[PDB]
Design a protein around this ligand. Sequence first.
Ligand SMILES: OC[C@H]1O[C@@H](O[C@H]2[C@H](O)[C@@H](O)[C@H](O[C@H]3[C@H](O)[C@@H](O)[C@H](O)O[C@@H]3CO)O[C@@H]2CO)[C@H](O)[C@@H](O)[C@@H]1O
Ligand SMILES: OC[C@H]1O[C@@H](O[C@H]2[C@H](O)[C@@H](O)[C@H](O[C@H]3[C@H](O)[C@@H](O)[C@H](O)O[C@@H]3CO)O[C@@H]2CO)[C@H](O)[C@@H](O)[C@@H]1O
Ligand code: CL
Ligand code: CU
Length: 235
Amino acid sequence: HTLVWGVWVNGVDQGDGRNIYIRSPPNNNPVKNLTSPDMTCNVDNRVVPKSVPVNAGDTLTFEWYHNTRDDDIIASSHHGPIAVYIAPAASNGQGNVWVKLFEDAYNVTNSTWAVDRLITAHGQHSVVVPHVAPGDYLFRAEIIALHEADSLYSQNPIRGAQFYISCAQITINSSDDSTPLPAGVPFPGAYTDSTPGIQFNIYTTPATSYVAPPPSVWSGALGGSIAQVGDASLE
Ligand SMILES: OC[C@H]1O[C@@H](O[C@H]2[C@H](O)[C@@H](O)[C@H](O[C@H]3[C@H](O)[C@@H](O)[C@H](O)O[C@@H]3CO)O[C@@H]2CO)[C@H](O)[C@@H](O)[C@@H]1O
Ligand SMILES: OC[C@H]1O[C@@H](O[C@H]2[C@H](O)[C@@H](O)[C@H](O[C@H]3[C@H](O)[C@@H](O)[C@H](O)O[C@@H]3CO)O[C@@H]2CO)[C@H](O)[C@@H](O)[C@@H]1O
Ligand SMILES: [Cl-]
Ligand SMILES: [Cu+2]
């Protein structure tokens, strides 16, 4: 159970974005139905009044929280991967539009899931803004909590992989467009009951064997991190 509070751009806090530049849902409950319209941008997908200005190459940091800013972030039980996708904003997230910019699942070197490291990072993970066409975009940050994912939601709706999905409205101003954004995958649609990484038993299957759901990270993606960029406590 987690939400995005706001974003940072090059280590500068853009301020509380909830219902302003984040298409915030009404609460921190997960989406679990893989065929739900709620898989696009969570349960209240609508245009919000602001879009955060960035340039290509900026570090864009998402900041998550549980109940209040800079708290425990997400229950430690919620082990799983983190991904970020981008789509042009005029799509409203509909159609074959989502391109993956970032994936982090289980780090064998550290012996930790992405969610475990997100807690240590005070809720913060970042991407480099890609060199796509200037214009308005949706950045879809997705945490998948796997503590109940041994079942399919379609078999037992009390269980299933849990999707914490947050869409930020981002405007890319300066970009040379050296990596034009291709068509991508649909949400809902990209994840199905048979997709690798959706049904996974963390109690019985080693995390060293986990394969995160496709699609693979786009060749145009410039990277990211799970690390505290900004100190919310200094404000
Ligand atoms: O026992 C089932 C699993 O519970 C997980 O805890 C979650 C609770 O089930 C859920 O009711 C609670 O929801 C809170 C939410 O955290 C809070 O932010 C909001 O204000 O109210 C909600 C409803 O009361 O969330 C927790 C997770 O934070 C355990 O983490 C898990 O191990 C356990 O299997
Ligand atoms: O962050 C670690 C996670 O990595 C996942 O693999 C993706 C990498 O994160 C991503 O950097 C890489 O990007 C490739 C790109 O696919 C390719 O087209 C381009 O030309 O070169 C890049 C090399 O940096 O993509 C991979 C696959 O999506 C793992 O899936 C995950 O287990 C791990 O935690
Ligand atoms: Cl839960
Ligand atoms: Cu939860």
